[PDB]
Amino acid sequence: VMKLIGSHASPYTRKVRVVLAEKKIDYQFVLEDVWNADTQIHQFNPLGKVPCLVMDDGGALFDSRVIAEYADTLSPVARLIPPSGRERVEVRCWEALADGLLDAAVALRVEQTQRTPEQRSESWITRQHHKIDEALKAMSRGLADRTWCNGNHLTLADIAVGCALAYLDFRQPQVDWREQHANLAAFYTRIEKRPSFLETQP
Amino acid sequence: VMKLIGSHASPYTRKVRVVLAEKKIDYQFVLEDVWNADTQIHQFNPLGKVPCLVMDDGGALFDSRVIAEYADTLSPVARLIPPSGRERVEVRCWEALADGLLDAAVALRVEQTQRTPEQRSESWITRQHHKIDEALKAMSRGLADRTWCNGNHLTLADIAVGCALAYLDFRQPQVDWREQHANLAAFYTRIEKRPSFLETQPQAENLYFQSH
Structure with a gap:
């Protein structure tokens, strides 16, 4: 096993x-x-x-x-990953976008847990928050009015995005992404039921 | 274009x-x-x-x-990337190992450029150096006696490893990875001449090739 x-x-x-x-x-x-x-x-x-x-x-x-x-x-x-062509690269890029939101969110967590208050940088914190804001905007623009991130079925893109939004709920619960992005709120309401x-x- | x-x-x-x-x-x-x-x-x-x-x-x-x-x-x-099977996954994993070495070396560069001396964390610096050390050991172990990381030809695995070793030469020259890992020193000698x-x-950032 x-x-x-x-x-x-x-x-x-x-x-x-x-x-x-x-x-x-x-x-x-x-x-x-x-x-x-x-x-x-x-x-x-x-x-x-x-x-x-x-x-x-x-x-x-x-x-x-x-x-x-x-x-x-x-x-x-x-x-979960299309075998080729345009759809494959689209799915890979969606995964990179979601992983990048995670990278920024995790960096914010690391700033609090792995650095003393005297070692923390407010400009770094601002920079990671900006990446999260911009990533969310891109996810919202990318999804538009569609049900799935890519094609018409569940892919690694959906899974990656779902994990990213859920991680914001867990570690950055003050980031009100649902208010800013109604399509992401609806997307997550669907995916969290799986x-x-x-x-x-x- | x-x-x-x-x-x-x-x-x-x-x-x-x-x-x-x-x-x-x-x-x-x-x-x-x-x-x-x-x-x-x-x-x-x-x-x-x-x-x-x-x-x-x-x-x-x-x-x-x-x-x-x-x-x-x-x-x-x-x-540069095998279409499937065992070889594809091995090449993807080699790329992640090289990219992770880069992540640690870049984390060190960020600790230099984006933190004031008063903000710098010796424990964080040690952690990233440990990752680089362990990544180099794995790259050396993985390559063994072979010419290329995977199969009989240059792949994305070799490119990624090459960029990682070159990046250490550029930003972290005190890491004597050549002395530690003879097989990596030989690998790099072969790839750097491509x-x-x-x-x-x-190093071309310094504008050397714009001189007449």
């Missing part, structure tokens, strides 16, 4: 867990705290980050984009 | 520029300082980062992984 090393809070881990649920791939979830000085994560991921997927042969895979892509090939249930999202809340 | 927004120093931009050169895809390189208060980057990439590839119709693509992947499809010259690498050195 493949092992996924991660945490319940990690939104990049959540992206992978939603993918695995949507693909109906069996796995064992192994919890690790990567921020603790005595973490053992470097035995498996040289970058010291979660998620990391460890196979039966002991092969380790990372990061979340690589794992999600691999998982899509492992099972015939759902079609069992894959229900079973992977942070 | 597509426009690539980037900087000479940016190693993620370099990865894309190397890919574009290997693929023989024409593009216009548009220099941008994303750290300037007057930057225009958010008019193209909502994340405010380089590289960003802008198409004839104004459509914008990011990040470097997505751009490199798209670029491999645009031309029949070389195949025209795609020669034409994209971050």
